[PDB]
Design a protein around this ligand. Structure first.
Ligand SMILES: O=C(O)C[C@@H]1CC[C@H](NC(=O)Cc2cccs2)[B-](O)(O)O1
Ligand SMILES: O=C(O)C[C@@H]1CC[C@H](NC(=O)Cc2cccs2)B(O)O1
Ligand SMILES: [K+]
Length: 263
């Protein structure tokens, strides 16, 4: 079937000229709303959640892991490093790298998380360990954001990412203190106010991770605590036909507004 919400998302997509993917889980009843929910999209910086979570999982058996210093060298800087560049020729702890990757979208920080996990495949292995058979990370920063149409590298589906984000933040994929740390980090994101957040009532609380890539790829994955009801998990992925397309965070806000109006 096609619901009223799905028809509105299709109209938004048609007007946008791009390709939109949405997955909602409403934990009030465990129901789902999907739009292109099983199509693949390039994750771009939303992949930073999986990398940080994989390090949190490692930290469950190493009380000092998050305090471990990691050297930052001039050669480690890439294309977007606002936190890591302040620590060149110094160090950042794994907690600092996680916070920088999640809350500031720092790409050097992400590369250090990936390296701590043994490369992109270590992030994929963690996804598999927590029940996600869809996610794949294949490259480091910055090339994981090329977002080429039809390329399977560094992709997932909306359905898979919503399920995984639920298990990480509201379920038991992580230990209790690690889940709480991930939620704290997401709630302190600096980059999200134009994306899913912008389509929701102002009284609701959001923790999210955005991403930007080539092909105008504009993404957001969020946990949402609405006023008066159980939490939601919402993924909104958007990608466009031209490599140089502009970001369209407003489309994500519009998708979130349609979802919220359908509850
Ligand atoms: O064109 C130029 O004169 C050089 C630019 C300068 C900085 C650029 N980097 C970014 O803007 C980081 C991003 C943040 C969010 C989306 S991209 B670049 O390193 O790509 O090259
Ligand atoms: O969180 C955000 O919205 C911003 C954040 C910026 C860093 C990452 N993007 C890039 O490095 C851009 C690239 C495009 C092609 C190659 S690199 B990420 O996907 O998004
Ligand atoms: K792993």
């Amino acid at each position: 079937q096609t619901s009223a919400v799905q028809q509105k998302l299709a109209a938004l997509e048609k007007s946008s000229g791009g390709r939109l993917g949405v997955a909602l889980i409403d934990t009030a009843d465990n129901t789902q709303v999907l739009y292109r929910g099983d199509e693949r999209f390039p994750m771009c910086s939303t992949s930073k959640v999986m990398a940080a979570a994989a390090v949190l999982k490692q930290s469950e058996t190493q009380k000092q892991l998050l305090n471990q210093p990691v050297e930052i060298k001039p050669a480690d800087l890439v294309n977007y490093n606002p936190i890591a560049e302040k620590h060149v020729n110094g160090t950042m702890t794994l907690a600092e790298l996680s916070a920088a990757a999640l809350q500031y979208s720092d790409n050097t920080a992400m590369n250090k998380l990936i390296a701590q996990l043994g490369g992109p495949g270590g992030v994929t292995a963690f996804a598999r360990a927590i029940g996600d058979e869809t996610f794949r990370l294949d490259r480091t920063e910055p090339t994981l954001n090329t977002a080429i149409p039809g390329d399977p590298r560094d992709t997932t589906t909306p359905r898979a990412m919503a399920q995984t984000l639920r298990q990480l933040t509201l379920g038991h994929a992580l230990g209790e203190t690690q889940r709480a740390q991930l939620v704290t980090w997401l709630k302190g994101n600096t980059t999200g106010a134009a994306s899913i957040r912008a389509g929701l009532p102002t009284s609701w609380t959001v923790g999210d991770k955005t991403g930007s890539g080539d092909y105008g790829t504009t993404n957001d994955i969020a946990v949402i605590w609405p006023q008066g009801r159980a939490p939601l998990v919402l993924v909104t992925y958007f990608t466009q036909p031209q490599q140089n397309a502009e970001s369209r965070r407003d489309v994500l806000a519009s998708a979130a507004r349609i979802i919220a109006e359908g509850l």
